[PDB]
Amino acid sequence: MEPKVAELKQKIEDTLCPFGFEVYPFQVAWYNELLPPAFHLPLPGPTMAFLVLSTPAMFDRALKPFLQSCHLRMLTDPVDQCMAYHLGRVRESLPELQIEIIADYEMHPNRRPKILAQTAAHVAGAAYYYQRQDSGVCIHPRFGGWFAIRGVMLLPGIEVPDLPPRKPHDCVPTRADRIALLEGFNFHWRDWTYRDAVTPQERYSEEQKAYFSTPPAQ
Protein backbone atom coordinates (compact mmCIF):
# COMPACT_ATOMS: atom_id res chain seq x y z
CA MET A 1 0.00 0.00 0.00
CA GLU A 2 1.01 3.61 -0.66
CA PRO A 3 3.19 5.16 2.12
CA LYS A 4 0.43 7.76 2.62
CA VAL A 5 -2.12 4.98 3.28
CA ALA A 6 0.30 3.05 5.53
CA GLU A 7 1.13 6.18 7.54
CA LEU A 8 -2.49 7.23 8.06
CA LYS A 9 -3.42 3.66 9.02
CA GLN A 10 -0.68 3.67 11.66
CA LYS A 11 -1.62 7.11 12.95
CA ILE A 12 -5.18 5.87 13.57
CA GLU A 13 -3.97 2.75 15.45
CA ASP A 14 -1.43 4.73 17.51
CA THR A 15 -4.32 7.02 18.45
CA LEU A 16 -6.94 4.33 19.22
CA CYS A 17 -5.29 0.99 20.12
CA PRO A 18 -3.55 2.07 23.35
CA PHE A 19 -7.06 2.88 24.65
CA GLY A 20 -8.68 -0.53 24.13
CA PHE A 21 -9.83 0.02 20.54
CA GLU A 22 -9.23 -1.99 17.35
CA VAL A 23 -9.42 -0.77 13.77
CA TYR A 24 -10.07 -2.89 10.71
CA PRO A 25 -9.62 -1.44 7.20
CA PHE A 26 -12.00 -2.25 4.35
CA GLN A 27 -13.08 -1.18 0.87
CA VAL A 28 -16.56 0.30 0.58
CA ALA A 29 -17.21 -2.11 -2.34
CA TRP A 30 -17.06 -5.20 -0.09
CA TYR A 31 -19.79 -3.75 2.10
CA ASN A 32 -21.99 -2.54 -0.78
CA GLU A 33 -21.83 -5.72 -2.94
CA LEU A 34 -24.19 -7.63 -0.64
CA LEU A 35 -26.54 -4.68 -0.12
CA PRO A 36 -29.18 -2.69 -2.08
CA PRO A 37 -28.31 0.93 -3.13
CA ALA A 38 -30.52 2.28 -0.31
CA PHE A 39 -28.15 0.85 2.30
CA HIS A 40 -24.98 1.63 0.32
CA LEU A 41 -22.13 3.80 1.53
CA PRO A 42 -22.48 6.84 -0.79
CA LEU A 43 -18.87 6.63 -2.05
CA PRO A 44 -16.87 4.95 -4.86
CA GLY A 45 -16.14 1.22 -4.39
CA PRO A 46 -12.39 1.40 -3.67
CA THR A 47 -12.84 4.10 -0.99
CA MET A 48 -11.09 3.23 2.23
CA ALA A 49 -13.12 2.67 5.38
CA PHE A 50 -12.27 1.59 8.93
CA LEU A 51 -14.37 -0.49 11.27
CA VAL A 52 -13.78 0.40 14.93
CA LEU A 53 -14.23 -2.15 17.74
CA SER A 54 -13.85 -1.70 21.48
CA THR A 55 -12.31 -4.52 23.54
CA PRO A 56 -12.64 -5.39 27.27
CA ALA A 57 -9.56 -3.20 27.81
CA MET A 58 -11.38 -0.02 26.76
CA PHE A 59 -13.40 0.37 29.97
CA ASP A 60 -10.29 0.70 32.14
CA ARG A 61 -8.10 2.44 29.53
CA ALA A 62 -10.69 4.81 28.04
CA LEU A 63 -13.94 5.07 30.08
CA LYS A 64 -12.67 5.37 33.68
CA PRO A 65 -10.22 8.05 32.64
CA PHE A 66 -12.15 10.79 30.81
CA LEU A 67 -14.94 10.13 33.34
CA GLN A 68 -12.48 11.61 35.84
CA SER A 69 -11.42 14.47 33.54
CA CYS A 70 -12.59 17.93 32.44
CA HIS A 71 -13.86 16.63 29.06
CA LEU A 72 -16.99 15.16 30.72
CA ARG A 73 -20.29 16.93 29.93
CA MET A 74 -23.85 16.46 31.24
CA LEU A 75 -26.88 16.00 28.92
CA THR A 76 -25.64 13.09 26.77
CA ASP A 77 -24.25 9.72 27.92
CA PRO A 78 -20.79 8.92 29.40
CA VAL A 79 -20.05 6.09 26.94
CA ASP A 80 -21.10 8.07 23.86
CA GLN A 81 -19.05 11.08 24.96
CA CYS A 82 -15.97 8.86 25.31
CA MET A 83 -16.45 7.51 21.77
CA ALA A 84 -16.85 11.09 20.48
CA TYR A 85 -13.75 12.14 22.42
CA HIS A 86 -11.43 9.44 21.01
CA LEU A 87 -12.85 9.58 17.47
CA GLY A 88 -12.29 13.33 17.69
CA ARG A 89 -8.64 12.60 18.53
CA VAL A 90 -8.42 10.74 15.20
CA ARG A 91 -9.62 13.89 13.38
CA GLU A 92 -7.08 16.00 15.29
CA SER A 93 -4.17 13.67 14.47
CA LEU A 94 -5.03 13.64 10.75
CA PRO A 95 -5.95 17.32 10.10
CA GLU A 96 -5.03 17.14 6.39
CA LEU A 97 -7.95 14.85 5.40
CA GLN A 98 -11.74 14.49 5.36
CA ILE A 99 -13.08 11.81 7.68
CA GLU A 100 -16.78 10.92 7.69
CA ILE A 101 -17.48 9.27 11.05
CA ILE A 102 -20.52 7.28 12.14
CA ALA A 103 -20.27 6.28 15.80
CA ASP A 104 -22.42 3.42 17.17
CA TYR A 105 -24.86 5.89 18.77
CA GLU A 106 -25.50 7.43 15.33
CA MET A 107 -26.70 4.16 13.82
CA HIS A 108 -30.41 4.72 14.39
CA PRO A 109 -33.66 5.29 12.41
CA ASN A 110 -34.11 8.55 10.45
CA ARG A 111 -30.35 9.13 10.04
CA ARG A 112 -28.07 8.63 7.03
CA PRO A 113 -25.93 6.79 6.31
CA LYS A 114 -27.56 3.54 7.44
CA ILE A 115 -24.82 1.28 8.80
CA LEU A 116 -25.30 -2.42 9.46
CA ALA A 117 -22.77 -2.84 12.28
CA GLN A 118 -22.57 -6.63 12.15
CA THR A 119 -22.29 -6.81 8.34
CA ALA A 120 -19.39 -4.32 8.54
CA ALA A 121 -17.72 -6.49 11.19
CA HIS A 122 -17.91 -9.45 8.82
CA VAL A 123 -16.62 -7.73 5.64
CA ALA A 124 -13.70 -6.09 7.45
CA GLY A 125 -12.77 -9.58 8.71
CA ALA A 126 -13.10 -8.28 12.27
CA ALA A 127 -15.62 -10.80 13.57
CA TYR A 128 -17.55 -13.69 12.01
CA TYR A 129 -21.27 -12.88 11.75
CA TYR A 130 -23.02 -16.21 12.44
CA GLN A 131 -26.53 -16.31 10.94
CA ARG A 132 -29.30 -18.87 10.22
CA GLN A 133 -27.80 -19.91 6.85
CA ASP A 134 -24.44 -20.84 8.41
CA SER A 135 -31.12 -13.72 14.56
CA GLY A 136 -27.35 -13.67 14.09
CA VAL A 137 -24.55 -12.87 16.50
CA CYS A 138 -20.98 -12.15 15.46
CA ILE A 139 -17.99 -13.55 17.34
CA HIS A 140 -14.53 -12.03 17.77
CA PRO A 141 -11.69 -14.53 17.16
CA ARG A 142 -9.96 -13.28 20.31
CA PHE A 143 -12.70 -11.90 22.59
CA GLY A 144 -15.70 -14.03 21.60
CA GLY A 145 -18.78 -11.95 22.41
CA TRP A 146 -16.98 -9.65 24.88
CA PHE A 147 -16.56 -6.68 22.53
CA ALA A 148 -18.64 -4.06 20.71
CA ILE A 149 -18.83 -2.41 17.28
CA ARG A 150 -18.18 1.26 18.09
CA GLY A 151 -18.08 3.03 14.73
CA VAL A 152 -17.14 3.16 11.06
CA MET A 153 -14.87 5.76 9.52
CA LEU A 154 -15.08 6.84 5.89
CA LEU A 155 -12.14 8.49 4.13
CA PRO A 156 -13.39 10.06 0.83
CA GLY A 157 -10.91 10.28 -2.05
CA ILE A 158 -8.43 7.92 -0.42
CA GLU A 159 -8.91 4.85 -2.56
CA VAL A 160 -7.29 1.45 -2.20
CA PRO A 161 -8.51 -0.88 -5.00
CA ASP A 162 -5.80 -3.49 -4.30
CA LEU A 163 -6.53 -3.93 -0.58
CA PRO A 164 -6.87 -7.71 -0.15
CA PRO A 165 -10.23 -9.08 1.13
CA ARG A 166 -9.68 -10.77 4.48
CA LYS A 167 -12.40 -13.15 5.62
CA PRO A 168 -13.28 -13.23 9.32
CA HIS A 169 -12.00 -16.30 11.16
CA ASP A 170 -14.52 -19.16 11.24
CA CYS A 171 -13.74 -19.50 14.95
CA VAL A 172 -16.85 -21.59 15.67
CA PRO A 173 -16.58 -24.09 12.79
CA THR A 174 -18.77 -27.02 13.94
CA ARG A 175 -22.49 -27.05 13.05
CA ALA A 176 -23.24 -28.09 16.65
CA ASP A 177 -21.45 -25.20 18.40
CA ARG A 178 -23.11 -22.80 15.93
CA ILE A 179 -26.60 -23.87 17.05
CA ALA A 180 -25.33 -24.04 20.65
CA LEU A 181 -24.43 -20.37 20.05
CA LEU A 182 -27.43 -19.01 18.15
CA GLU A 183 -29.95 -20.64 20.50
CA GLY A 184 -27.94 -19.55 23.55
CA PHE A 185 -28.12 -16.03 22.09
CA ASN A 186 -31.72 -15.97 20.79
CA PHE A 187 -33.21 -17.60 23.91
CA HIS A 188 -30.83 -17.06 26.85
CA TRP A 189 -29.17 -13.68 26.24
CA ARG A 190 -28.82 -12.88 29.96
CA ASP A 191 -26.64 -16.00 30.26
CA TRP A 192 -23.37 -14.54 28.94
CA THR A 193 -21.93 -18.03 28.42
CA TYR A 194 -22.63 -17.47 24.70
CA ARG A 195 -19.91 -14.77 24.75
CA ASP A 196 -17.44 -17.50 25.80
CA ALA A 197 -18.02 -19.39 22.51
CA VAL A 198 -14.37 -18.56 21.97
CA THR A 199 -12.83 -18.22 25.45
CA PRO A 200 -11.35 -14.67 25.57
CA GLN A 201 -7.99 -13.46 26.88
CA GLU A 202 -9.47 -10.57 28.88
CA ARG A 203 -13.06 -10.63 30.11
CA TYR A 204 -15.29 -7.85 31.42
CA SER A 205 -14.41 -7.13 35.05
CA GLU A 206 -17.14 -6.96 37.70
CA GLU A 207 -17.33 -3.14 37.60
CA GLN A 208 -17.55 -3.29 33.80
CA LYS A 209 -20.25 -5.98 33.93
CA ALA A 210 -22.22 -3.95 36.48
CA TYR A 211 -21.92 -0.81 34.35
CA PHE A 212 -23.17 -2.33 31.10
CA SER A 213 -25.95 -4.35 32.74
CA THR A 214 -27.34 -1.01 33.97
CA PRO A 215 -30.24 0.44 31.94
CA PRO A 216 -29.16 3.94 30.73
CA ALA A 217 -30.50 6.18 33.53
CA GLN A 218 -28.43 8.64 35.65
From Swiss-Prot:
It comes from Homo sapiens (Human). The keyword Oxidoreductase applies. One of its GO terms (biological process) is glutathione metabolic process. One of its GO terms (cellular component) is cytosol. GO terms for molecular function: cobalamin binding; cyanocobalamin reductase (cyanide-eliminating) (NADP+) activity; demethylase activity; FAD binding; glutathione binding; oxidoreductase activity; protein homodimerization activity; transferase activity, transferring alkyl or aryl (other than methyl) groups. Its EC number is 2.5.1.151, 1.16.1.6. Monomer in the absence of bound substrate. Homodimer; dimerization is triggered by binding to FMN or adenosylcobalamin. Interacts with LMBRD1 and ABCD4; the interaction ensures the transport of cobalamin from the lysosome to the cytoplasm. Forms a multiprotein complex with MMADHC, MTR and MTRR; the interaction with MTR could modulate MMACHC-dependent processing of cobalamin. Heterodimer with MMADHC; the interaction might play a role in the regulation of the balance between AdoCbl and MeCbl synthesis. This is Cyanocobalamin reductase / alkylcobalamin dealkylase. Keywords: Cobalamin, Cobalt, Cytoplasm, Disease variant, FAD, Flavoprotein, FMN, NADP, Oxidoreductase, Phosphoprotein, Transferase. Cobalamin (vitamin B12) cytosolic chaperone that catalyzes the reductive decyanation of cyanocob(III)alamin (cyanocobalamin, CNCbl) to yield cob(II)alamin and cyanide, using FAD or FMN as cofactors and NADPH as cosubstrate. Cyanocobalamin constitutes the inactive form of vitamin B12 introduced from the diet, and is converted into the active cofactors methylcobalamin (MeCbl) involved in methionine biosynthesis, and 5'-deoxyadenosylcobalamin (AdoCbl) involved in the TCA cycle. Its cofactor is FAD; FMN.
